[PDB]
Amino acid sequence: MLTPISIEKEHIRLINLLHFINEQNRWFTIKELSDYLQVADKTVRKYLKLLEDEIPPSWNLLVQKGKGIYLKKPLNESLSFVESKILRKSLNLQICEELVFKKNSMQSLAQKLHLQVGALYPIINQINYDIQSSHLNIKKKPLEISGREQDVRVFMLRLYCNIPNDYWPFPYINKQNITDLINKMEKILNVQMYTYSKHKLCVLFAITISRLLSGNTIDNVSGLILVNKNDDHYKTVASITSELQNSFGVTLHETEISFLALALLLSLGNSISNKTLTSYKKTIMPLAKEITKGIEHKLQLGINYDESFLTYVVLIIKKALDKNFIQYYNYNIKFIRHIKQRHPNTFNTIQECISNLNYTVYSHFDCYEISLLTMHFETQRMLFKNNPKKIYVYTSQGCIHREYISALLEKRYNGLIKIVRNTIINLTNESLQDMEIDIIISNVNLPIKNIPIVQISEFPTERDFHEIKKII
Amino acid sequence: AMLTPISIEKEHIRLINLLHFINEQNRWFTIKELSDYLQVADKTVRKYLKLLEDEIPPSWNLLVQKGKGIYLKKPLNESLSFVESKILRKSLNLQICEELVFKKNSMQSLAQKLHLQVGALYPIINQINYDIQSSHLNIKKKPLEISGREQDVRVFMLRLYCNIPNDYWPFPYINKQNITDLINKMEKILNVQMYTYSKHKLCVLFAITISRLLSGNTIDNVSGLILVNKNDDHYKTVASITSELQNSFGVTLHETEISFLALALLLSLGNSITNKTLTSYKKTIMPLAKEITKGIEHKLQLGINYDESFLTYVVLIIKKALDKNFIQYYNYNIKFIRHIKQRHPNTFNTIQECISNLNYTVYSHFDCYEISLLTMHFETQRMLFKNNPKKIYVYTSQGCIHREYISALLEKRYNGLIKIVRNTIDMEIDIIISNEFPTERDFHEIKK
Numbered sequence A: 001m002l003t004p005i006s007i008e009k010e011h012i013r014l015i016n017l018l019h020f021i022n023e024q025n026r027w028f029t030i031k032e033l034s035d036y037l038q039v040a041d042k043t044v045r046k047y048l049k050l051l052e053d054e055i056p057p058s059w060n061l062l063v064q065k066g067k068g069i070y071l072k073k074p075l076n077e078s079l080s081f082v083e084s085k086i087l088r089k090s091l092n093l094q095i096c097e098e099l100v101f102k103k104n105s106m107q108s109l110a111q112k113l114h115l116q117v118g119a120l121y122p123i124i125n126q127i128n129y130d131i132q133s134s135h136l137n138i139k140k141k142p143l144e145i146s147g148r149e150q151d152v153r154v155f156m157l158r159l160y161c162n163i164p165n166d167y168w169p170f171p172y173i174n175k176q177n178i179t180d181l182i183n184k185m186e187k188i189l190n191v192q193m194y195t196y197s198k199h200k201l202c203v204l205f206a207i208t209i210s211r212l213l214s215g216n217t218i219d220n221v222s223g224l225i226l227v228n229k230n231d232d233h234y235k236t237v238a239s240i241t242s243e244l245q246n247s248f249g250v251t252l253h254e255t256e257i258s259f260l261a262l263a264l265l266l267s268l269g270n271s272i273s274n275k276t277l278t279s280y281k282k283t284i285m286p287l288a289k290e291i292t293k294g295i296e297h298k299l300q301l302g303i304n305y306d307e308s309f310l311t312y313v314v315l316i317i318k319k320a321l322d323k324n325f326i327q328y329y330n331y332n333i334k335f336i337r338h339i340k341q342r343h344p345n346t347f348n349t350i351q352e353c354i355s356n357l358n359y360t361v362y363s364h365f366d367c368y369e370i371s372l373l374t375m376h377f378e379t380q381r382m383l384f385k386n387n388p389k390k391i392y393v394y395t396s397q398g399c400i401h402r403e404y405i406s407a408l409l410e411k412r413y414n415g416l417i418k419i420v421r422n423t424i425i426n427l428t429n430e431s432l433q434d435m436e437i438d439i440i441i442s443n444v445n446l447p448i449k450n451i452p453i454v455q456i457s458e459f460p461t462e463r464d465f466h467e468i469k470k471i472i
Numbered sequence B: 001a002m003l004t005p006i007s008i009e010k011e012h013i014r015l016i017n018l019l020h021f022i023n024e025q026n027r028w029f030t031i032k033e034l035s036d037y038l039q040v041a042d043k044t045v046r047k048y049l050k051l052l053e054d055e056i057p058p059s060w061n062l063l064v065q066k067g068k069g070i071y072l073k074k075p076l077n078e079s080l081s082f083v084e085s086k087i088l089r090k091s092l093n094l095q096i097c098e099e100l101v102f103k104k105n106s107m108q109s110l111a112q113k114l115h116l117q118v119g120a121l122y123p124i125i126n127q128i129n130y131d132i133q134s135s136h137l138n139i140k141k142k143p144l145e146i147s148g149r150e151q152d153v154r155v156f157m158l159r160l161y162c163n164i165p166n167d168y169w170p171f172p173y174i175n176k177q178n179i180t181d182l183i184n185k186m187e188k189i190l191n192v193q194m195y196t197y198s199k200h201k202l203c204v205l206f207a208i209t210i211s212r213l214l215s216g217n218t219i220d221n222v223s224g225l226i227l228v229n230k231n232d233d234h235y236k237t238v239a240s241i242t243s244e245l246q247n248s249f250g251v252t253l254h255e256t257e258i259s260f261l262a263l264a265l266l267l268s269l270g271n272s273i274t275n276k277t278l279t280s281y282k283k284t285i286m287p288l289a290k291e292i293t294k295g296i297e298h299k300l301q302l303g304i305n306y307d308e309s310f311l312t313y314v315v316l317i318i319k320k321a322l323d324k325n326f327i328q329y330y331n332y333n334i335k336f337i338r339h340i341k342q343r344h345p346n347t348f349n350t351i352q353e354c355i356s357n358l359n360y361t362v363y364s365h366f367d368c369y370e371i372s373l374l375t376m377h378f379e380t381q382r383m384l385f386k387n388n389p390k391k392i393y394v395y396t397s398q399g400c401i402h403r404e405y406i407s408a409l410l411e412k413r414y415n416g417l418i419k420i421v422r423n424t425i426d427m428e429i430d431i432i433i434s435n436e437f438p439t440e441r442d443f444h445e446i447k448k
């Protein structure tokens, strides 16, 4: 199965591969590289050609033409130097930036790129085709990408998923003026941000500023994810909004503050931790709820999903969104396929339900996150089908006698039952349901309705064990 | 004015539809206007018109007033099949698709056949693999082939041929007449008459199926939403001919294979030369019409019960889409569609999303138009449910003439805010007026 790959993400694939080659202290055969990238051996060689020629003299790459290639750079340098070159060269990257940030006609854009219109227009058509799954379009006059504003911005941000930490794609926006504002938010929130995370929050601030400069602003938020206007994160952005409006001559209405605030909050997914997690959970919980409802509707498990099941769903969503604030993606490919072979129908179903969200959300869900959800839900199916019946032991004779009965029930039934040793505060249907009790075994009559009770003697008789057996 | 999403796999379809359009219109077409229909550069439009000059007979009326654009009307007694076929054979992507679905190959072997370097073929393969994800297909590496559900692979290939000419046969190892003979017998057995193109497209599908069976691939698994009843005439017709089919071609048809061919046969009869196949159609497609309605309703939440009449229209819409295989050329309606889309953009998108969650066998046939049809059809119910008034039963112990009189009084008061049920003592009734000639006391009571 060839991996489905697109011309928009070529630069992403090259960067990840280059990183892979370096981390591994081993030889890479041309056959093996051809297969990672999915290209002709001759194309693997054109790339090695650029690589060898663009390495700084500091690094060394070996090629004995029988065992393949080997790359080692010093531990103190980063891959930034070559990574940036890959980006500055990527033609399709430049076109996507043009189409999102700049004024052009077909002919004007063809000019900047030193291309014949008959060379550009097939590429544009392909790009228009590829982005349909993202709910975007390319309109013809002026020549630009269009769609829901937040979808357009995340698209750009996702194409920058693995940019180096010192790579700034906006020459017409001075970085420090964004950095000053972030330093200030970091201070107000009394948190410390990882370098990469921060850089990427700067990049998202600049994507947003550039759009506002071009006339483009958010005029519709779906409700599924809003930063509450009383949250520390909305308010911390609101604090810097005036300095930002004055540095760059833009206007941030409420819904832009909320968006940047969401960005802020997400970039703190990891920081070098309490009130953060809480805003995180309140903000994402409604999405976790819609996802769960979506999937349940197709899987028909019949379960009620409790709050800690939904908290894991927030966790997985968080892993998804954090990809913007961590440079390099870890692979897991074997792990993923094992999950996919074990639960193929469930895997596809969840893929479908995630793909019916907004692009803002499903842009971040790959096979791995889907495999995460797949395990999450299949775990419930096993627990609901295999968990033993929970039993509450009620006795007029006090707690020593309660325990003694409890051990007798266990001696007899082992794993067909689970004794609930906590003392129930009262006998209302709510107190029983919040201990998830299925069966009460009592030596006393009780005013209780909708839940099997087996009245037994103060020491169970064989008749008692027989009644209990039936309803277990 | 959004650029249309277009794929490299359907260039040949686009050029054939355009060539047909330039002919059928008795008016000029400017170069700019052709560039926009095809979403290509002027150099590229000009290059196509050059190829068109050179392959058109000089008998055929082809004008090029540079500044006015171009004009064409072929003689009424000749076919475009001539030029369309050249478009089909020239198309590289279509040949790669055919290779991928019908042949054994490796990368190096396929690049050999197409006289290309591997570094020119591989990007095209990646692009196709990327484009067919939404069809639930994939490309295997070894052997190099297209992969997915067998019904889906077949329909993929069938739709790449959506507008091939009536004599176009891309199967040099399947003897066309050997298939036509089998279809002819079925046409006799059902006592019906097919249109020529429809018949040709049913032979094509047969050849696709036969080519696939010989290459190892058969249908393992149905969806359930469309099977022909194993007691249905159509199934039995196919069962008649199956044995000779098998000894001719050296393939075995199990039950589900027969059922697929029976489906094709029945869809191809969608249109034919003038009652009974219509009833058989409805039976087979009604389960899908119910699935489509239930999925859409789940998202629109209109709260209605959809009647047998509403469903039957869904089935009509489905037929319109499935008929695209048995009608060569596609008429467009761009304006009409975008009007519908503007009037109901959220409903449009929801229906698009719902349809796209069916199997590819189905959603391959739904483009903007069919989505637009379903959108009206569902926004229509919304409007009925809301504006259609409350039904009333007049009951009086005074005779049927007092009953009529009081009924007419009410109508003369409230007009279309009510609707009288003239049938006698589950009949859609909400309100009961009963007791002798109403007064104001009675009237304001009836308002509420």
Ligand SMILES: CCCCCCCCCCCCO[C@@H]1O[C@H](CO)[C@@H](O[C@H]2O[C@H](CO)[C@@H](O)[C@H](O)[C@H]2O)[C@H](O)[C@H]1O
Residues within 6 Å of the ligand: A014, A017, A018, A033, A044, A047, A048, A050, A051, A054, A082, A085, A086, A089
């Ligand atoms: C097999 C593993 C492969 C993974 C890693 C391989 C990717 C390596 C990235 C190579 C990118 C090199 O980035 C390099 O930048 C310099 C400028 O600084 C460009 O310099 C360019 O100048 C002009 C055009 O602008 C021309 O003379 C020529 O087209 C080019 O030399 C190179 O065209 C580009 O190749």
Ligand SMILES: CCCCCCCCCCCCO[C@@H]1O[C@H](CO)[C@@H](O[C@H]2O[C@H](CO)[C@@H](O)[C@H](O)[C@H]2O)[C@H](O)[C@H]1O
Residues within 6 Å of the ligand: B015, B018, B019, B022, B034, B045, B048, B049, B051, B052, B055, B083, B086, B087, B090
């Ligand atoms: C723009 C509006 C008009 C839309 C309609 C577009 C019309 C397009 C019609 C062109 C059909 C192509 O017609 C096809 O072209 C090539 C010429 O390139 C012909 O011939 C080709 O054959 C040999 C094969 O050995 C090639 O190596 C050679 O270079 C070429 O001449 C085909 O035999 C002919 O069938």
